[PDB]
Amino acid sequence: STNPPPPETSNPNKPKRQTNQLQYLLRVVLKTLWKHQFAWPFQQPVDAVKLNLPDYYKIIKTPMDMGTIKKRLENNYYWNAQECIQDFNTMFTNCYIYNKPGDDIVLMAEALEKLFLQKINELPTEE
Numbered sequence: 001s002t003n004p005p006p007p008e009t010s011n012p013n014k015p016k017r018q019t020n021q022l023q024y025l026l027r028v029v030l031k032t033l034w035k036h037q038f039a040w041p042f043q044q045p046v047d048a049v050k051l052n053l054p055d056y057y058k059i060i061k062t063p064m065d066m067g068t069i070k071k072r073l074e075n076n077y078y079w080n081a082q083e084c085i086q087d088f089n090t091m092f093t094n095c096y097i098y099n100k101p102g103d104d105i106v107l108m109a110e111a112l113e114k115l116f117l118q119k120i121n122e123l124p125t126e127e
């Protein structure tokens with residue numbers, strides 16, 4: 001099997017805006033998670049081809065990763081902060097759906113999600 005194309009990251013047919021919450025999600029949330037010791041499995045789409053996992057995209061039909069989230073934030077793809085937050089949650093849920101609980105990949109996702117929830121609990125009120 002090939003990999004699927006990555007999720008769409010740009011759409012010139014929908015309106016664009018910048019807000020302080022989206023700025024916070026790119027500059028504080030994404031930046032802090034990206035530099036984490038355990039970020040590297042989530043920084044790009046799961047490469048089922050290189051990792052020889054033929055059933056990954058048979059099980060995971062809504063893939064998401066922090067490289068896509070990065071690109072969507074940079075392209076002003078999100079109108080609402082909640083759209084981005086939902087993408088982060090999809091990434092974590094995909095990991096918990098596919099991977100063995102208590103094993104290395106899941107432990108790494110849990111560490112990132114804890115940090116994610118801490119930063120989101122400090123999401124600034126709309127400017």
Ligand SMILES: CNC(=O)N1CCc2c(c(N3CCCc4cc(-c5cnn(C)c5)c(C(F)F)cc43)nn2C2CCOCC2)C1
Pocket residue numbers: 041042046050051052053056094095098099100105
């Ligand atoms: C968020 N990532 C994610 O959800 N994933 C899906 C499942 C997965 C991944 C890896 N990773 C990730 C870490 C790097 C890695 C490296 C190799 C590898 C082996 N040799 N070389 C040169 C590299 C392999 C291997 F499967 F090919 C797998 C993986 N494992 N699993 C499964 C875990 C259950 O058990 C079977 C493998 C990603």
